[PDB]
Design a binder for this molecule. Structure first.
Ligand SMILES: Cc1[nH]c2ncnc(NC[C@H]3NC(=O)CC3(C)C)c2c1C
Ligand SMILES: [Cl-]
Length: 167
């Protein structure tokens, strides 16, 4: 049993809810919140910009130190950093950005990072301003993630479409 409330069960291990991941994290304080990151951990917009704002820019400060030490992530890669006031940990995962020409086959590699954590709160990778089809992102998620993933979908219209089209 966990504290996630109001989710629709899609599969054995995947759950979905129309919710702002920021407000959901502040309420649940999960062990792991997933950020829709880029390789430079520049959290300007989309989910990343929103999560960072909720930490009062502490996420960005920590991220800049991480990059100064380690260099950029790989597309499809991830790193674990602090969850600040939102979660114990933040798993920064780089889905491919279609508006940059990045290979969509890397979306599966991106979701594989979730399997290193028993339970996570997460957005659909490469959705929103990353330019991929959210229906496809949900499908890759279901077919790749084996640990327990709670998806927060901000847009109500999109959430309804994702549920009604789910096979
Ligand atoms: C403030 C905020 N909270 C979120 N919580 C979950 N997902 C988010 N966006 C990623 C993709 N999922 C969507 O519904 C829209 C999308 C960009 C296609 C967000 C955002 C921008
Ligand atoms: Cl986003």
């Amino acid at each position: 049993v966990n504290s996630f409330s109001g989710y629709l069960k899609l599969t054995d291990n995947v759950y979905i809810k129309n919710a702002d991941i920021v407000e959901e994290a502040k309420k649940v304080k999960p062990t792991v919140v997933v950020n829709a990151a880029n390789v430079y951990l520049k959290h300007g917009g989309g989910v990343a910009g929103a999560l960072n704002k909720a930490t009062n820019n502490a996420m960005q400060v920590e991220s800049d130190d991480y990059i100064a030490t380690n260099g950029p992530l790989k597309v499809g890669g991830s790193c674990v950093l602090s969850g600040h006031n939102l979660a114990k940990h933040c798993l920064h995962v780089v889905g491919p950005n279609v508006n940059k020409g990045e290979d969509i086959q890397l979306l599966k590699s991106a979701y594989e990072n979730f399997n290193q954590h028993e339970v996570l709160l997460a957005p659909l990778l490469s959705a929103g301003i990353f330019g991929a089809d959210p229906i496809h992102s949900l499908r890759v998620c279901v077919d790749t993630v084996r640990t327990n993933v709670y998806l927060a979908v901000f847009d109500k219209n999109l959430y309804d479409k994702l549920v009604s089209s789910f096979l």
